[PDB]
Curated annotation (Swiss-Prot):
Gene Ontology MF: a single term: beta-N-acetylglucosaminidase activity
Organism for this UniProt entry: Gallus gallus (Chicken)
Lineage: Eukaryota, Metazoa, Chordata, Craniata, Vertebrata
Note: Lysozyme C is capable of both hydrolysis and transglycosylation; it also shows a slight esterase activity. It acts rapidly on both peptide-substituted and unsubstituted peptidoglycan, and slowly on chitin oligosaccharides.
Subcellular location: Secreted
Gene name of this polypeptide: LYZ
Binding of substrate, residues: D101
Protein name according to UniProt: Lysozyme C
Length: 129
């Protein structure tokens, strides 16, 4: 599914991401925009053989099992395919663990390069929560 911007903000807000670990809702919308273009079905293969999955491009090296990433961990304890559902609950729950691990949202390369230090509040303006 391809989310609308406000639609996604509302879904993220319901799942407790607004100000989760100090990151306002605009940060998460911005990250999803540039990681996946708001597409829950997005996949991208990394050079090391791992693959990124879903709306926040969560990586099979550490976070999910795709059965084809030798020597990897499954820290969110889920198959990587569950991160491709139109229900975003699994992505959000895994993202909360990732963002708590010490590096905050710097784990998402697009966020660090394209959202960090910008007016992220712009991403939720005009939205009905
Ligand atoms: Cl929308
Ligand atoms: Cl894995
Ligand atoms: Na932080």
């Amino acid at each position: 599914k391809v989310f609308g911007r406000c639609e996604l903000a509302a879904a993220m807000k319901r799942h407790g991401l607004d100000n989760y670990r100090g990151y306002s809702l605009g940060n998460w919308v911005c990250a999803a925009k540039f990681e996946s273009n708001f597409n829950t079905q997005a996949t991208n293969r990394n050079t090391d053989g791992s693959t990124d999955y879903g709306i926040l491009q969560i990586n099979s090296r550490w976070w999910c099992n795709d059965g084809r990433t030798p020597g990897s961990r499954n820290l969110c304890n889920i198959p990587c395919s569950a991160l491709l559902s139109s229900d975003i609950t699994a992505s959000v729950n895994c993202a909360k663990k990732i963002v708590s691990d010490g590096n905050g949202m710097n784990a998402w390369v697009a966020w660090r390069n394209r959202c960090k230090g910008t007016d992220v509040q712009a991403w939720i303006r005009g939205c009905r929560l």
